[PDB]
Amino acid sequence: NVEGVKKTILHGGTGELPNFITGSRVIFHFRTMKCDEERTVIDDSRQVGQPMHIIIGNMFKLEVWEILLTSMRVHEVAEFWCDTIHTGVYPILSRSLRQMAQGKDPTEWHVHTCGLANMFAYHTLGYEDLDELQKEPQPLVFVIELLQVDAP
Ligand code: NA
């Protein structure tokens, strides 16, 4: 448990806690929503396509999304409300997922240059919804569905 984050389980997982060691790969679906009346969806892995797949970089120093994932069991579906303090990073993080969904490598030099240039010129991440999210810091809910943990 971390401050500013409420976990709710909507479908209980199966089995013992996955082995969430350094280098293991987590396959999951997720949906991100505002906390407005409509619960406006910001991103939805199922809608766009295939599930996300991340590698735990270091079990001893977890990324924020790893803090979420490593609390989960296979097949679990949980909703995590995260206060404004945890979510200011989400728009750039979504930016980068969205470009990888496309054919673009956000780490390639021409892509990253264009991003910084448009961001300085136009104060934009390339996406109206993420821009409005960054201009208005606020809570988000992430619903995550954990599908599979693979050993390294
Ligand atoms: Na399901």
Curated annotation (Swiss-Prot):
Domain PPIase FKBP-type: 46-138
Effect of R46W: No interaction with NUB1
Disease as annotated in the protein's UniProt record: Leber congenital amaurosis 4: A severe dystrophy of the retina, typically becoming evident in the first years of life. Visual function is usually poor and often accompanied by nystagmus, sluggish or near-absent pupillary responses, photophobia, high hyperopia and keratoconus.
Chain segments annotated as transmembrane: none
Function per UniProt: May be important in protein trafficking and/or protein folding and stabilization.
Localisation: Cytoplasm; Nucleus
Protein name as annotated: Aryl-hydrocarbon-interacting protein-like 1
Record note on quaternary structure: Interacts with NUB1.
